[PDB]
């Protein structure tokens, strides 16, 4: 749909859509930018992530409302409408995963880009896993696990423990363990070890980097407080 717009114009309009809180537009613009075939800059990767995180976040919140209504109920309308929202959510996840597979991940050579995209792949398989109930649900869960695990291996080799991407990845992998994999002890261990190793590296950081890292450490702490 965006094939006739300049890459730079798509990026400019994604930023405008973000300011207008028009996240569906933002995602379509960033999808078009990705499909230009060039690698994404750090800022552009963040725009891609913000756009789709907000779109799928609204779908997930709606699915949870409807799933809760459906559970209390057991006509076909509640199930039908939950299925409609669920199908739309799966479509958005498939779109993101398709962008990562064609061809963001294979062209991502630097640790910051490769870990970023593999974290995204884990996240969107995780969102698929949240609604999965059929023959492929175990494979969906393992696909999330595998993507997160590769990202973790690279991040531990190539990034400092305070790196915000590394911290956000560990945060989300810990949520995967707690919420999806039924592994709360793994979730807690990962969050604690991530927090403690970041704490011990804060002394190396500038004031601005310190603020970036401690913000995400607080989310790890919030989860540990919820879980223990």
């Amino acid at each position: 749909a965006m094939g006739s717009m300049e890459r730079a114009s798509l990026i400019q309009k994604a930023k405008l859509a973000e300011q207008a809180e028009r996240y569906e537009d933002m995602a379509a613009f960033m999808k078009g930018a990705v499909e230009k075939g060039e690698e994404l800059s750090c800022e552009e990767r963040n725009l891609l992530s913000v756009a789709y995180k907000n779109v799928v976040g609204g779908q997930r919140a709606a699915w949870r409302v409807l799933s809760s209504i459906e559970q209390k109920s057991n006509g076909p309308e509640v199930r039908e409408y939950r299925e409609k929202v669920e199908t739309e959510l799966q479509g958005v996840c498939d779109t993101v995963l398709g962008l990562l597979d064609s061809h963001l991940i294979k062209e991502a050579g630097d640790a910051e880009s490769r870990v970023f995209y593999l974290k995204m792949k884990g996240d969107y398989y995780r969102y698929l896993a949240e609604v999965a109930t059929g023959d492929d649900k175990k494979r969906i869960i393992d696909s999330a696990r595998s993507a997160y695990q590769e990202a973790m291996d690279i991040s531990k080799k190539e990034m400092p423990p305070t790196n915000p991407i590394r911290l956000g990845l560990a945060l989300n992998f810990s949520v995967f363990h707690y919420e999806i994999a039924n592994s709360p002890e793994e979730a807690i261990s990962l969050a604690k070890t991530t927090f403690d190793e970041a704490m011990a590296d804060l002394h190396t950081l500038s004031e601005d980097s310190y603020k970036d890292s401690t913000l995400i450490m607080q989310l790890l702490r919030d989860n540990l407080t919820l879980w223990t």
């Binding site: 913000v50 996240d123 956000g168 945060l171 949520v175 919420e179 989860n223």
Partner: peptide, 7 residues
């Protein structure tokens, strides 16, 4: 209910 990464 737990927090995943957010802005």
């Amino acid at each position: 209910r737990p927090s995943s990464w957010r802005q």
